[PDB]
Amino acid sequence: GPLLEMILITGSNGQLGTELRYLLDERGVDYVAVDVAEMDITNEDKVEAVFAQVKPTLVYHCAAYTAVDAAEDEGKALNEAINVTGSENIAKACGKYGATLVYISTDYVFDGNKPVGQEWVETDHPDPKTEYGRTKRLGELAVERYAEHFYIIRTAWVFGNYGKNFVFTMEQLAENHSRLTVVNDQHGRPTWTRTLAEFMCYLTENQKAFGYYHLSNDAKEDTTWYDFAKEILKDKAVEVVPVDSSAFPAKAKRPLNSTMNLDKAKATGFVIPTWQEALKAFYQQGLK
Numbered sequence: 001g002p003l004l005e006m007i008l009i010t011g012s013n014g015q016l017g018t019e020l021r022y023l024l025d026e027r028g029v030d031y032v033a034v035d036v037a038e039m040d041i042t043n044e045d046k047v048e049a050v051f052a053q054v055k056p057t058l059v060y061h062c063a064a065y066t067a068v069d070a071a072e073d074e075g076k077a078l079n080e081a082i083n084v085t086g087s088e089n090i091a092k093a094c095g096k097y098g099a100t101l102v103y104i105s106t107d108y109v110f111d112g113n114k115p116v117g118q119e120w121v122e123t124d125h126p127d128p129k130t131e132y133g134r135t136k137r138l139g140e141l142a143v144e145r146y147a148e149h150f151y152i153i154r155t156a157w158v159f160g161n162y163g164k165n166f167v168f169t170m171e172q173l174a175e176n177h178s179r180l181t182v183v184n185d186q187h188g189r190p191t192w193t194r195t196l197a198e199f200m201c202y203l204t205e206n207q208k209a210f211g212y213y214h215l216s217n218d219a220k221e222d223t224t225w226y227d228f229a230k231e232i233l234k235d236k237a238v239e240v241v242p243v244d245s246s247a248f249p250a251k252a253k254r255p256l257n258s259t260m261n262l263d264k265a266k267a268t269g270f271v272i273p274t275w276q277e278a279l280k281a282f283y284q285q286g287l288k
């Protein structure tokens with residue numbers, strides 16, 4: 001209420017939701033955690049029922065549908081339900097209960113038509129070309145409309161120890177395949193869920209200004225998926241082969257350069273590791 005902070009985590013068993021739960025555990029912060037089997041964000045009656053019981057003042061919205069290629073076709077309906085309907089439901093619930101809403105969005109809200117070396121800023125106009133990115137942008141607009149107190153954090157290429165991601169896909173494939181093909185003409189930056197969870201909590205702990213923030217891990221140089229995969233699999237007996245995006249017919253028309261400018265997040269005081277340092281820490285944390 002006005003005197004008690006009450007934290008609700010949605011999508012709490014995802015890779016980001018789990019990371020955040022563990023982070024708040026470390027800091028001795030209490031929360032209520034829900035995922036599909038406790039509060040299906042597409043069911044507005046269930047969302048209302050949970051909010052009536054919990055009365056959150058702060059909601060970390062980590063539920064999402066993030067299968068980019070499936071969202072173009074076989075998962076098109078579920079992508080829309082979770083990322084549009086679900087986003088609207090959570091933003092409306094937060095507005096009704098007066099809760100601050102931290103909404104995680106994506107670098108894929110941009111069209112990607114930006115020269116290598118240039119970066120997308122929070123004030124740039126979204127124009128997404130993937131089903132996934134379209135629905136996340138609609139989720140941003142719902143949050144903007146219904147949650148008066150909000151942080152929209154656009155992140156990218158998310159990986160961490162507590163769910164499925166590009167890193168574990170690559171390692172699984174390397175267990176039985178000697179040659180892998182990874183695009184070298186799609187530019188962006190990985191984001192470790194631990195960095196993202198820490199930034200999520202840095203904004204709220206320090207009551208930074210509401211609005212939009214870009215958060216990926218950082219890079220001294222250009223980064224493509226190939227660069228990421230090459231580093232992921234450097235201890236493996238697999239050849240990572242750079243290809244361009246026309247080498248194989250892809251279902252999703254992914255942005256060619258969705259590298260996010262990080263100046264605004266840096267201006268908060270938050271220190272952003274490079275993705276190389278983050279990946280090394282991810283490997284160390286996974287041993288726990």
Ligand SMILES: NC(=O)c1ccc[n+]([C@@H]2O[C@H](COP(=O)([O-])OP(=O)(O)OC[C@H]3O[C@@H](n4cnc5c(N)ncnc54)[C@H](O)[C@@H]3O)[C@@H](O)[C@H]2O)c1
Nearest residue numbers: 011013014015016036040041042063064104106157158163
């Ligand atoms: N995977 C990426 O590279 C990537 C890239 C850009 C942005 N993001 C954003 O990161 C956020 C979450 O990241 P993640 O990597 O942990 O995704 P994730 O797939 O690991 O898990 C997200 C959680 O959403 C849950 N969920 C789905 N539908 C639900 C529903 N109807 N009700 C309740 N829960 C539901 C899922 O079961 C899951 O636990 C999302 O906002 C995503 O859009 C991710």
Ligand SMILES: O=C(O)Cc1ccc(CO)cc1
Nearest residue numbers: 066067068069108155156157
């Ligand atoms: O492609 C996939 O299914 C996983 C994925 C999702 C979103 C983004 C955008 O950052 C990148 C990768």
